[PDB]
């Protein structure tokens, strides 16, 4: 009945020293029934990464919509959109459906190509911006992720350390949520290289 907890899933983003990390589970379900363990919730438009939790139809729709908007942006601007600007575009796009919203919890992650400053942001379904220094969480196990991140996180972690922290934050949060898990992906993002890691985790 509640749209934002039919399909389930989680996204978490963290900042480190000259790097950002964004991670998601792989589950898509019809409430209790698990359907797919290949449903990735993290998309990228150039060097800007977007994770989306919530109703899966809207996850897919918004991905297609932001690909559309970022493609036109690049053609007209003759440069890739930056995280700060893309954050404003997500907010705009969500609030224009104020009284008929997309049932999503978006998360923006990326490094500003010019300033080299690591950037993360989260949104509510009507496009209110949460621009945290430390970490952003989203999905059915947001409470669990808030608890894990708030204890595990410390500032200025090196890329290979940050990987372990975000991974343990996701994995342990997902295992305490019925509608989350069935595999997990972690993106480690540096200024001009991006590593993508699939995690071993209990499949129930």
């Amino acid at each position: 009945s509640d749209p934002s907890s039919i399909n389930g899933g989680i996204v978490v983003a963290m900042t480190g020293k000259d790097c950002v990390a964004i991670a998601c589970d792989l589950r898509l379900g019809s409430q209790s029934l698990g359907v797919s363990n290949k449903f990735e919730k993290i998309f990228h438009y150039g060097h800007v990464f977007l994770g989306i939790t919530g109703l899966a139809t809207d996850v897919t729709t918004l991905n297609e919509m932001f690909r559309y908007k970022t493609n036109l942006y690049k053609l007209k601007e003759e440069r890739a959109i930056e995280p700060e600007t893309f954050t404003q575009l997500v907010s705009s796009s969500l609030y224009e459906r104020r009284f008929g919203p997309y049932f999503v919890g978006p998360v923006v992650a990326g490094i500003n190509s010019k300033s080299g400053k690591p950037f993360i942001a989260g949104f509510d379904l009507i496009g209110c911006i949460d621009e945290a220094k430390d970490f952003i969480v989203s999905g059915t196990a947001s409470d669990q992720l808030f608890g894990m991140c708030e204890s595990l996180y410390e500032p200025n972690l090196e890329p290979e350390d940050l990987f372990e922290t975000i991974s343990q934050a996701l994995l342990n949060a997902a295992d305490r949520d019925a509608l989350s898990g069935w595999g997990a992906v972690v993106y480690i993002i540096k200024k001009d290289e991006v590593v993508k890691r699939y995690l071993k985790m209990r499949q129930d």
């Binding site: 509510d124 379904l125 009507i126 209110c128 949460d130």
Partner: peptide, 4 residues
Amino acid sequence: XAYX
């Protein structure tokens, strides 16, 4: 949703 978020809501001082």
